[PDB]
UniProtKB/Swiss-Prot annotation:
Expressed in the brain and in cerebrospinal fluid (at protein level). Expressed in all fetal tissues examined with highest levels in brain, kidney, heart and spleen. Weak expression in liver. In adult brain, highest expression found in the frontal lobe of the cortex and in the anterior perisylvian cortex-opercular gyri. Moderate expression in the cerebellar cortex, the posterior perisylvian cortex-opercular gyri and the temporal associated cortex. Weak expression found in the striate, extra-striate and motor cortices. Expressed in cerebrospinal fluid, and plasma. The chain holds residues 385 to 567 of 770 of the full protein. It comes from Homo sapiens. Chelation of metal ions, notably copper, iron and zinc, can induce histidine-bridging between amyloid-beta molecules resulting in amyloid-beta-metal aggregates. The affinity for copper is much higher than for other transient metals and is increased under acidic conditions. Extracellular zinc-binding increases binding of heparin to APP and inhibits collagen-binding. Residues 1-181 form the E2 domain. This is Amyloid-beta precursor protein. Proteolytically processed under normal cellular conditions. Cleavage either by alpha-secretase, beta-secretase or theta-secretase leads to generation and extracellular release of soluble APP peptides, S-APP-alpha and S-APP-beta, and the retention of corresponding membrane-anchored C-terminal fragments, C80, C83 and C99. Subsequent processing of C80 and C83 by gamma-secretase yields P3 peptides. This is the major secretory pathway and is non-amyloidogenic. Proteolytically cleaved by caspases during neuronal apoptosis.
């Protein structure tokens, strides 16, 4: 959660920076108007255009900064989650092979593993849903890529969960608590 904090922080600074640049422009627009009070229409009809283009330019720059921020964030989070999933999966598989097997320990490890996968899915889905509400057409461009990722996560988790059946006794003892997890 230290990287979700680092992202929500960076997102706000970016907003404050943009909102700040937007203010000095609107301000400059004022001084430019006052200082053109005596210029001709054409030259006045041009100061408006100049500042609309400057505003438009600022918006594009902020949008760019947002996208670069999200991309980097998605890359970072992905590498961390995969690393988290691998470890948790390793611990879970190891728990299953303990002699004798400890139901509680198997459950705790399996839980950390399911949460990691649930986390990855939710995070991917949340970011894809964000883009779809803001830009439906852009979302349509990354849809297959996103759905493919979701299908991989789901299959991996279900494949990992079915391992529990190689230790039926253990599965019996913790089945209900596992259901609570998957729901
Ligand atoms: Zn995120």
């Amino acid at each position: 959660e230290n990287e979700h904090a680092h992202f929500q922080k960076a997102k706000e600074r970016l907003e404050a920076k943009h909102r700040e640049r937007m203010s000095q422009v609107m301000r400059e627009w004022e001084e430019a108007e006052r200082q053109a009070k005596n210029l001709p229409k054409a030259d006045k009809k041009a100061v408006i255009q100049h500042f609309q283009e400057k505003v438009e330019s600022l918006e594009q720059e902020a949008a760019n900064e947002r996208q670069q921020l999200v991309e980097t964030h998605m890359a970072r989070v992905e590498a961390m989650l995969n690393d988290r999933r691998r470890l948790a999966l390793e611990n879970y598989i190891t728990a299953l092979q303990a002699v004798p097997p400890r139901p509680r320990h198997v459950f705790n490890m399996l839980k950390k593993y399911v949460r990691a996968e649930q986390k990855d899915r939710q995070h991917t889905l949340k970011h894809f849903e964000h883009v779809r509400m803001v830009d439906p057409k852009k979302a349509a461009q990354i849809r297959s890529q996103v759905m493919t990722h979701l299908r991989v996560i789901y299959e991996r988790m279900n494949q990992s969960l079915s391992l529990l059946y190689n230790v039926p006794a253990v599965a019996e003892e913790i089945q209900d608590e596992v259901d609570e997890l998957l729901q």
